[PDB]
Amino acid sequence: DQDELAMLIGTYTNGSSKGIYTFRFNQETGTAVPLSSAALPNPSYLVPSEDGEFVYAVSEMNDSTAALSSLAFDRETGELRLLNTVPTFGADPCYVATNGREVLTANYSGGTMSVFPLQKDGTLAPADTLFQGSATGPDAIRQATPHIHCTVFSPDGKYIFATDFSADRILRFVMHPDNPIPHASLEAVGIEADSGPRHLTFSPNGKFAYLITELSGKVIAFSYDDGCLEQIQTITADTVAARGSADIHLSPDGKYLYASNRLKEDGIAIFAVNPENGTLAKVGYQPTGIHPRNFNITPNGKYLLAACRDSNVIQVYKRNEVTGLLEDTHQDIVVDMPVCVQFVS
């Protein structure tokens, strides 16, 4: 039961999928049992609350119906209950984060970040403020209008970072101790032109942050200290430059970094992380099912689960703690268009 976790799968609902699918996943055997489901349009990204009692899921719509929903989650039965839905006021919300006081969405087509204060019952108050991203990048198709692709809380609980995808930079927001709405910083952290910064993650020790760039197919490593991101290294994640890189995660011991690639030679690039200076070096590559837009690693670090949207499976890989390399267990979880994997302990 200790190694039996609650797993939440987010999807695109244009196919046979009806929304969020819940499972009981064993982080020792890598076995999964279907539990329940919640009907919700395009919940492409979802996040559970720290206590695992609430789930916040986007409805990735390219219009005025674009929304964020709050759900009550029953950890033991895997059942979900819709509580409330509020508009994002920004098309294509594709990422969601929570610190328990507020909820954030990255509105890709809106080109904005929406900030939702949480209500005492865990439901969402309407989006209080939206913060505007910019379009200055040279990709005429992908960087034509502002796109926000990630909205993350800094591990010291004082800042918010957002990927300004079309302006090749990372936006910084200073959090207030009392107000759930942050202050926008006057300066952003610039990266190489034609990068398309997609997802940002912090190392388990909170001293480093790593960015996966969609267009340049790079992993960008940063030292992190009290709101300051300092670039220390750029490394190739996608050697065929398919301009379709997606997700990034470190193993919970912080020793290995994983970055996923789509469109061509779909798979996961594996890097060893230097303990003292946070630099990266490739250890291998894992070819996966088609379109690994999202993946996650179990809390014990024993398994890597890769959601392959076009293969309609979540592939279960056994992680070698020592080498960082992956072994397909061939215990595929069949879901139509899986695009988000979250765990609840």
Side-chain angles (χ1 to χ4, degrees), residues 1-119 121-157 159-186 188-345:
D1 205 284
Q2 190 189 282
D3 296 288
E4 294 275 1
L5 311 154
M7 187 182 66
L8 315 156
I9 306 302
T11 71
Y12 283 114
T13 56
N14 48 297
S16 57
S17 172
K18 65 181 237 166
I20 303 151
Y21 293 96
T22 72
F23 297 89
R24 187 192 83 164
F25 190 80
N26 194 321
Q27 59 168 0
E28 279 300 326
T29 67
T31 213
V33 172
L35 293 174
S36 197
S37 58
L40 207 69
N42 294 329
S44 72
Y45 209 96
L46 55 96
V47 72
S49 59
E50 178 61 36
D51 65 2
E53 279 190 283
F54 297 94
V55 173
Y56 304 98
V58 304
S59 279
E60 193 178 351
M61 319 300 290
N62 56 292
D63 61 5
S64 62
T65 67
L68 182 67
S69 299
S70 73
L71 301 99
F73 182 55
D74 194 336
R75 271 175 277 181
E76 66 175 284
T77 68
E79 285 177 298
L80 276 163
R81 194 214 311 148
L82 192 65
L83 306 175
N84 87 314
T85 303
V86 283
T88 52
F89 306 120
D92 293 320
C94 62
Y95 197 96
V96 48
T98 185
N99 67 350
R101 188 185 63 177
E102 52 271 2
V103 183
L104 314 175
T105 69
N107 311 321
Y108 181 90
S109 297
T112 54
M113 169 180 82
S114 306
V115 185
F116 311 76
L118 280 166
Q119 310 268 41
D121 62 356
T123 65
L124 299 149
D128 184 276
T129 305
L130 265 70
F131 293 92
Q132 183 68 54
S134 298
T136 60
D139 192 316
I141 298 147
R142 305 297 316 282
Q143 302 179 298
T145 57
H147 306 306
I148 299 291
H149 222 313
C150 187
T151 58
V152 287
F153 291 97
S154 71
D156 53 29
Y159 307 94
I160 293 159
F161 294 95
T163 52
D164 206 7
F165 180 98
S166 300
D168 295 305
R169 77 203 177 147
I170 300 159
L171 303 176
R172 193 241 259 167
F173 302 88
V174 179
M175 289 171 58
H176 191 269
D178 305 303
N179 198 325
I181 313 308
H183 177 102
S185 282
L186 282 137
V189 181
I191 63 172
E192 281 279 289
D194 202 40
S195 292
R198 195 182 191 272
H199 284 185
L200 184 77
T201 193
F202 293 86
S203 63
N205 66 2
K207 288 178 184 177
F208 299 98
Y210 299 86
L211 181 73
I212 182 63
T213 63
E214 185 162 333
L215 306 175
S216 58
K218 305 293 186 181
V219 173
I220 306 171
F222 299 88
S223 70
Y224 175 72
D225 190 51
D226 190 33
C228 175
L229 288 169
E230 210 138 296
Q231 189 184 143
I232 53 164
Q233 184 198 4
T234 294
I235 192 154
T236 298
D238 182 357
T239 59
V240 300
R243 301 178 68 86
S245 288
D247 212 11
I248 189 166
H249 297 274
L250 285 98
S251 56
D253 56 10
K255 295 178 167 198
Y256 288 97
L257 185 141
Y258 302 85
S260 70
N261 302 314
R262 307 166 287 165
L263 312 179
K264 293 209 237 80
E265 306 298 334
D266 303 56
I268 296 162
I270 314 165
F271 305 93
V273 184
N274 183 297
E276 69 250 355
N277 62 38
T279 56
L280 310 167
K282 209 166 183 165
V283 298
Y285 193 84
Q286 181 60 57
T288 65
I290 315 306
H291 207 91
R293 175 177 170 114
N294 185 274
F295 68 91
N296 207 341
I297 302 165
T298 60
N300 70 358
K302 271 169 188 186
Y303 290 89
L304 191 150
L305 279 86
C308 307
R309 187 199 72 181
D310 302 340
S311 280
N312 294 318
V313 287
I314 307 112
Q315 303 179 312
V316 172
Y317 292 98
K318 195 178 286 170
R319 266 200 80 246
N320 184 295
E321 316 301 298
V322 175
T323 71
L325 299 179
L326 307 171
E327 272 214 349
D328 193 359
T329 75
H330 307 295
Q331 306 183 267
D332 291 350
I333 303 147
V334 181
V335 171
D336 194 80
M337 290 170 94
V339 288
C340 192
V341 182
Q342 296 281 17
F343 297 115
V344 184
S345 293

